[PDB]
């Protein structure tokens, strides 16, 4: 999922938005919310939580939302972490905020992307820079 | 012009010499679409580059991802010579497989022709398969020789070479044109190159003078050889070329001063010349010394394609220097050329010019062809012919003429139509007025959407976007428009955004009526129109209004004022119509039917009854993929039913629903079709391959038969039964088939059954289906009792009393003429290659009085019973022999039947017989009270109480009767051995020698054989003619012709069904018997694979429903 | 003419690459083979940067402009700035743009007489924009979005837009622009066309993703 | 779904022209034709499994008939034509 994008896992990281947590929508699917099942690529070890990224591409299930889209299994992509993070500049993003986006695995992102997007992410999902709100 | 507005479209096609559709038939896709589409670029039509460039040959998107070309579509194909104008208006039909309903029904709908042959895979079999039943209908087919840029420039064969490779393909063909049409002129020809200079050595005296000689006199011609008019070209196009013979004398005429007539005639053939002042003559030759194309021309036109490529300019400029093909310049700024190359040719090489004046002025007007084609399609009366002057109405006569006087409602001919849609994704919206997009947008581009009404509407606002840059400065533009600056190609708003509505399926057609006026009437009748039917027989319909003198059902006048051209997208009006061009009905599909034409005038001729089934009637189960969606799916059938024609979704022999095509090959693709558009329908599929069908040529020596080949030790047609296994009721010392006579009613329906082997050539006959009951009976068409029914007796040899059958009858004399009044079924349907004749003796009131049939002579005053026959039959040959689906060349005779019986005690049987009727059971007058039951006896002429001594209706009922015949028969034959008939096809593959052993091994393991494999000196071909079955070809020919074209080219042919040694019959009974061994037979077989499961297409019942009175043979005390 | 060109074997050449009238601009993407491609095509016509923009991969929706002005946000170093400067000629005005509220590129679609803004775009922001360039700025979305310049394949010649975009707005739009407006996609029915395919005046790219047809179409329309 | 079957019956003279009078609007009754001399036949119409229905109200009336004729649960005997 795809996989040919776009590209790298993308450099220095910081984990923090786990299994279990949810997470803003951040687009126009009737959703609100992305609560995380898990996160693909996270092969771990004993009781340990795949934990998910800024870009780190995310099973998902709205928890709430359109109940033509409540229940299933659903993916996305994850755009904000409510904790910081350090970068290949040596500096600190910060968002109290958190979020998602609602895509198939495909690698397409439904329509427009609502507040800031992370950098990272951007360059990672050219789906994403490409209906990018806000790119910080 | 290059956009053509409508009005001028419209005049030019009132002008004369303005239509004749081609079609464009060749393979599935060799490049047919890239040929295509550069004429298209070429011709000033819509935008001109709008057009072409991979726009117009597979009419969907759909089609076009799949490499699979299935609908037919409608376009505007208009050139510009200088003065003249000539119009096509191009049907791109689509060019499918063998064994199709698409490609047919397409040939006979377009006016004219145009035939693609290759020259580096040779000629088409698919395009000669259609072509060959296209030649009974009036067209005008132009030859054009492709892919010689694929011998000459692309692999890169000298011109030599490309001379010998051409008298192969002319030869081909000539083979073509020998079918149905003359083949002489084209070998004369051939001899000797047009009609003028005889001798070779006076070709030196005339060609260093400037004359035009080598004259042809121009003369009318389909695709006969008279140089095509004197302008003959080969038609090829992969990067903007054309070449043609013409376009290569022009270019010798300008180097020195022999002309353009001269190299029509040398060109063509394989000449050589001198050179001391270019001396052309058939002399000078050794073994091919000096070609005219090696040396001069063709030579330099490898130079060019080379130099467009890489850009080198100066190589370029030598080509151009010829005349004017231009350098190029200001096109390949960032170097990498494309559009470049096709700039450079599209100048000088195309052959618009030579081609569609041919098909224009070879018929001087429009009023030939169209007028013609009605005897050959079908015409309003079957024998009296009233669709011609006879049945005198002005307004019919003029449009049999064809012109019309100023007026006209307007009669379509339809047997296939653009896609049925519920949206319209390939057809614009008719918003701005009733009709009209073509010009009316240009208009509103340069009036409405320009500054003076786009201000009005909300420019300087922008949807009131107050306190912002919108409305700081208020802008007004000065005329935004996109017109006079990319040839009219983009207006603001040009393709609407398509809307759900009423208005939205599609068509072309083509018009058999002249010129019209806008406001045009059209006649909703009955469900076949009824007037029109009336005029077949004797004349009693009239020009009158109907459901007035003239009888029909419903009656409605409807007004019909959405009609268009068609040019791929968009709408145009239409009201100076000439006859021959397309103009189909517009947003509206349900003022038409397929059964007969659109009923418009009182007196029309209905052109089609029926289009095409296959041969071998091959169906598939198409199921509910949801049970919610079922109602769907059944709307979805008769949606595509308009688009792609013919299938049973009403009116069924099998099942609720089935999907039928014209053959194996195609019943797959069109199931690709009902999973798209229509009701948004989705199926699931149960295909236990195509049905085949069972024959009987060995009955027993047990009980009544007279002719038979049964023994003491010969019980099956190979080996024993025994010794197949299954199938021994009694021993094999008087053979194993025996029980064929049966008692039901105790003696009040006694009868015997013999099935012999019907002759191959009657039953061929017969398959053609002239034993028609419509034909005999009733009021569908043909005289009931005058000199039609001879032509019934001359193929069936049935009759009013029959007493020597079919079987003996035949045999000594054929083609009888006699009137035939009374019928058992020709057939499961009454039709089919089955027949029952009854030579039995009058007992009492026996065997005669059918459904309407009264002599009034034998079986008293036709008394009784009788029709339990003539029904019964049909449902004994609708299933098999053991229960499952149709069987073919069997001979049915009655030898005896009883109606009375002497018994005078009753039976159990009988007795539950007599509680279902309501009547109390005898043979004989036995008993008081109750004289009405539920038989059909009574009902027609009363009982047989009082009228004659001995009632025997009393017991057995008409419908148990009935049900009795159809065990019975089934009975007989099912324990006589039933060899399989399997429907085989010769496959005329063309191909080479190499590969063809390779080809031939995978067909053997296909159950084919081979009955020859020849060589044909002449072609480049070599052909087999080897047998294979249509049920295990099931997408067979369409992967070997994709995997290897050219060297594997299956011509697929029908021929007959082969019979070949196997019993195909459900559970193997006994292995004791197998343990003896003679092959497997009767049990689960290579047989039973044709027979598995195809009783259920969903099927008339869950397995088989059946009740019998012939068991218990104590209660009837019969010894049969 | 029009080339089918790739992006780390994606379909998307208007992420990684930007091409208007004038000036293109690549980021440092770790695959070279692509970067010289571009270069090719463009040799003594248009140079090409090869410098990743805000230090990133993202170049074609992260800026704006074609070649009277051009654009970028306050996330880029004056650094980055300078060396974008150096790369392009020095006749065109690129700038800095203050008080981030959007990524321009998708919200900034332009022509060399007006542009297309987002809208909600602030009101002095706006007028920097509109200084930089020289040209207009038009407060209008498209129709379902707010994104234009994704949504928008704006130049001179042609314009693309997907067939969401409605009847009116469309209407008014080619009359605002004075260029029409064409229904239509790339990429099998991809929804962002703008990013599918950059469009120069004189060459076009897209995607490899393209269809014969589709790619047919969108020459038509831009007039090559 | 289904279809319905014509389980058959022979009526007195006297009182299956009362049942008639009964039995016409309540339920579906077919191939009716009253007679002094030759009784009256009449068709309930059931397909099998409503056959208790259909009896009851005879039963309950005039009790049995001359003849009572019942047919298979899968076919009519004679084809159904029925829904």
Redesign the interface.
């Known amino acids: 999922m795809s996989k040919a994008q776009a590209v790298g896992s993308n450099y220095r990281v910081s984990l923090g938005l786990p299994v279990g947590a949810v997470m803003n929508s951040a687009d126009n699917s009737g959703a609100k919310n992305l609560y995380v099942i898990a996160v693909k690529g996270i092969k771990g070890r004993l009781n340990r939580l795949p934990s998910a990224g800024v870009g780190d591409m995310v099973m998902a299930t709205v928890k709430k939302g359109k109940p033509e889209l409540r229940k299933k299994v659903c993916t996305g992509l994850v755009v904000r972490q409510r904790k910081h993070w350090k970068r290949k500049d040596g500096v600190y993003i910060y968002f109290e905020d958190n979020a998602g986006v609602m895509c198939n695995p495909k690698g397409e992102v439904k329509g427009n992307i609502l507040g800031p997007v992370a950098k990272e992410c951007s360059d990672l999902w050219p789906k994403v820079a490409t209906n990018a709100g806000t790119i910080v | 012009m290059v956009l053509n507005s409508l009005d001028k479209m419209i005049q030019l096609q009132k002008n004369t010499a303005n239509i004749r559709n081609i079609c464009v038939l060749a393979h599935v896709d060799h490049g047919k679409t890239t040929l295509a589409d550069c004429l298209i670029s070429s011709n000033g039509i819509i935008s001109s580059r709008l057009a072409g460039k991979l726009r117009y040959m597979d009419s969907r998107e759909d089609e076009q991802i799949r490499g699979i070309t299935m609908k037919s579509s409608a376009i505007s194909l208009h050139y510009a010579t200088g003065n003249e104008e000539y119009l096509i208006n191009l049907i791109d039909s689509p060019g499918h497989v063998d064994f199709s309903s698409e490609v047919s029904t397409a040939v006979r709908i377009c006016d004219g022709c145009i035939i693609v042959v290759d020259a580096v895979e040779g000629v088409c079999p698919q395009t000669q398969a259609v072509l060959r039943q296209a030649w009974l209908e009036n067209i005008r087919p132009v030859l054009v020789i492709n892919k010689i840029d694929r011998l000459i420039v692309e692999l890169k064969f000298t011109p030599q070479e490309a001379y010998s490779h051409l008298k192969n393909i002319l030869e081909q063909i000539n083979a073509l044109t020998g079918t149905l049409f003359t083949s002489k002129v084209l070998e004369e020809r051939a001899e000797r190159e047009t009609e003028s200079q005889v001798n070779p050595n006076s070709e030196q005296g005339e060609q260093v003078y400037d004359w035009s000689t080598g004259l042809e006199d121009t003369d009318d011609s389909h695709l006969y050889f008279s140089p095509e008019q004197g302008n003959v070209v080969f038609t090829s196009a992969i990067d903007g070329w054309g070449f043609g013979i013409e376009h290569f004398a022009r270019i010798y005429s300008q180097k020195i001063g022999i002309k353009k007539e001269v190299l029509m005639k040398t060109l063509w053939g394989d000449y050589y010349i001198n050179m001391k002042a270019k001396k052309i003559m058939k002399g000078d030759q050794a073994k091919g010394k000096k070609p005219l194309f090696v040396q001069l021309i063709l030579e330099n036109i490898w130079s060019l394609y080379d130099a467009v490529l890489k850009k080198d300019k100066d190589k370029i400029d030598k080509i151009v220097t010829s005349l004017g093909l231009k350098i190029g310049a200001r096109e390949a700024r960032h170097s990498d050329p494309k559009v470049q190359i096709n700039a450079i040719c599209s100048q000088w090489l195309p052959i618009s010019h030579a081609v569609l004046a041919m098909v224009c002025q070879k018929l001087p007007s429009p009023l030939d062809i169209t007028a013609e084609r009605v005897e050959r399609l079908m015409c309003t009366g079957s024998q009296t012919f009233d669709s011609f002057p006879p049945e005198t109405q002005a307004l019919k006569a003029a449009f049999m003429k064809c012109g019309s006087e100023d007026t006209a409602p307007v009669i379509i001919f339809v047997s296939k139509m653009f896609a049925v849609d519920a949206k319209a994704l390939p057809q614009n919206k008719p918003r701005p007025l009733t009709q009209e997009e073509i010009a009316q947008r240009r208009e509103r581009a340069r009036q409405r959407h320009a500054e003076k009404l786009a201000a009005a509407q909300g420019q300087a606002p922008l949807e009131p976007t107050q306190d912002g840059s919108a409305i700081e400065t208020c802008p007004k533009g000065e005329e935004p428009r996109g017109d006079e600056q990319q040839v009219e190609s983009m207006t603001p708003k040009p393709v609407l955004q398509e809307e759900n509505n009423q208005e939205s399926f599609i068509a072309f057609a083509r018009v058999f009526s002249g010129v019209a006026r806008r406001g045009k009437k059209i006649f909703v009748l009955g469900p076949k129109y009824s007037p029109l039917e009336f005029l077949r027989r004797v004349p009693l319909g009239f020009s009158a209004p109907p459901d007035g003198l003239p009888q029909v059902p419903h009656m409605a006048y409807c007004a019909l004022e959405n009609l268009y051209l068609l040019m791929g997208r968009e709408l145009e009006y239409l009201e100076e119509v000439p006859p021959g061009n397309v103009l189909g009905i517009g947003g509206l599909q349900d003022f038409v039917l397929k059964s007969a034409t659109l009923c418009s005038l009182p007196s029309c001729p209905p052109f089609i009854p029926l289009n095409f089934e296959a041969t071998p009637i091959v169906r598939v189960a198409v199921e509910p993929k949801h049970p919610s969606e079922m109602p769907q799916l059944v709307k979805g059938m008769k949606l595509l039913n308009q688009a792609d024609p013919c299938v049973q979704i009403l009116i069924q022999e099998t099942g609720e629903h089935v999907l039928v095509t014209a053959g194996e090959v195609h019943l797959q693709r069109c199931l690709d079709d009902l999973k798209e558009r229509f009701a948004k329908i989705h199926i699931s599929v149960s295909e236990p391959i195509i049905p085949f069908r069972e024959t009987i040529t060995k009955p027993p020596k047990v009980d009544m038969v007279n002719e038979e080949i049964g023994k003491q030790q010969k019980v099956a047609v190979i080996h024993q039964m025994k010794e197949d296994q299954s199938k021994i009721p009694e021993g094999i010392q008087v053979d194993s088939d025996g029980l064929i006579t049966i008692t039901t009613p105790n003696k009040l329906a006694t009868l015997s059954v013999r099935a012999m082997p019907l002759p191959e050539e009657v039953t061929q006959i017969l398959e053609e289906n002239s034993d028609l009951i419509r034909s005999m009976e009733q009021l569908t068409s043909s005289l009931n009792e005058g000199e039609n029914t001879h032509m019934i007796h001359q193929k069936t040899q049935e009759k009013i009393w029959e007493f020597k059958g079919k079987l003996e009858q035949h045999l000594t004399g054929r083609r009888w003429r006699n009137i035939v009044d009374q019928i058992w079924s020709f057939g499961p349907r009454k039709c089919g290659p089955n027949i029952l004749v009854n030579k039995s003796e009058d007992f009492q009131n026996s065997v005669w009085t059918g459904p309407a049939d009264k002599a009034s002579k034998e079986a008293s005053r036709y008394r009784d019973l009788g029709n339990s026959i003539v029904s019964g039959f049909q449902l004994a040959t609708l299933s098999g022999p053991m229960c499952e689906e149709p069987l073919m060349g069997v001979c049915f005779v009655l030898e005896k039947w009883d109606l009375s019986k002497f018994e005078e005690q009753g039976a159990s049987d009988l007795a539950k017989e007599g509680?279902?009727e309501?009547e109390t059971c005898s043979g004989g007058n036995e008993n008081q009270?109750?004289?009405?039951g539920?038989s059909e006896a009574f009902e027609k002429r009363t009982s047989q109480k009082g009228e004659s001594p001995l009632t025997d209706c009393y017991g057995p009922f008409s419908?148990?009767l009935i049900?009795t015949m159809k065990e019975a028969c089934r009975y007989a034959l099912q324990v006589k051995p039933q060899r399989l008939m399997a429907a085989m096809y010769t496959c005329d593959i063309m191909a080479t020698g190499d590969v063809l052993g390779r080809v031939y091994a995978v067909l053997s393991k296909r159950e084919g054989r081979v009955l020859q494999e020849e060589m044909k000196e002449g072609t480049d071909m070599f052909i087999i003619k080897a047998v294979l079955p249509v049920a295990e070809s099931f997408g067979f020919a369409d992967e070997i012709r994709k995997r290897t074209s050219g060297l594997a080219s299956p011509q697929l042919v029908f021929s007959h069904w082969e019979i070949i040694p196997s019993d195909p019959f459900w559970v193997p009974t006994t292995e004791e018997e197998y343990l003896h061994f003679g092959e497997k037979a009767d049990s689960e077989n290579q047989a039973r694979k044709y027979m598995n499961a195809v009783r259920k297409r969903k099927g008339l019942?869950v397995e088989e429903?059946i009740?019998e009175h012939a068991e218990k043979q104590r209660t009837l005390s019969k010894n049969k | 003419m029009a080339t089918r060109l790739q992006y780390e074997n994606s379909c998307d050449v208007g992420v990684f690459l930007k091409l208007t009238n004038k000036y293109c601009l690549v980021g440092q993407c770790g695959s070279k083979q692509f970067l010289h491609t571009v270069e090719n095509r463009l040799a003594d016509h248009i140079p090409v940067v090869e410098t990743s923009i805000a230090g990133t991969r993202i170049v074609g929706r992260l800026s704006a402009g074609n070649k009277n002005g051009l654009l970028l946000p306050n996330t880029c170093t004056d650094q980055e700035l300078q060396q974008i400067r150096n790369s392009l000629p020095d006749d065109v005005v690129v700038q800095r743009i203050e008080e981030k509220f959007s990524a321009l590129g998708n919200c900034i679609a332009t022509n060399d007489y007006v542009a297309l803004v987002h809208p909600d775009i602030d009101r002095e922001t706006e007028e920097i924009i509109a200084d930089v360039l020289g040209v207009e700025v038009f407060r209008q979305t498209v129709s379902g979005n707010v994104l234009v310049g994704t949504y928008c394949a704006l130049t001179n010649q042609g314009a693309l837009v997907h067939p969401m975009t409605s009847i009116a707005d469309q209407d008014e739009l080619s009359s605002l622009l004075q260029v029409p407006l064409v229904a239509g996609t790339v990429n099998r029915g991809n929804e962002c066309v703008a990013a599918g395919c950059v469009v120069n005046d004189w060459t076009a790219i897209v995607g490899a993703d393209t269809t014969a047809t589709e790619i047919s179409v969108i020459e038509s329309i831009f007039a090559l | 779904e289904r279809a319905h079957m014509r389980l058959?019956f022979?009526l007195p003279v006297n009182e299956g022209k009362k049942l008639k009078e009964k039995l016409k609007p309540l339920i579906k009754v077919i191939?009716s034709?009253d007679y002094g001399?030759?009784?009256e036949?009449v068709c309930l119409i059931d397909p099998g499994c409503f056959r208790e229905i259909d009896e009851l109200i005879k039963k309950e009336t005039k009790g049995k008939g001359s003849?009572e004729?019942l047919?298979?649960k899968?076919?009519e005997?004679?084809?159904e034509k029925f829904e």
């Not at chain 2, 009270?929 to 009405?932: A, C, G, I, P, R």
């Open positions: 509680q279902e309501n009270e109750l004289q009405d539920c419908g148990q049900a019942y429903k009740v | 058959r022979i191939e034709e001399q030759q009784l036949i003849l004729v047919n298979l899968d076919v005997e004679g084809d």
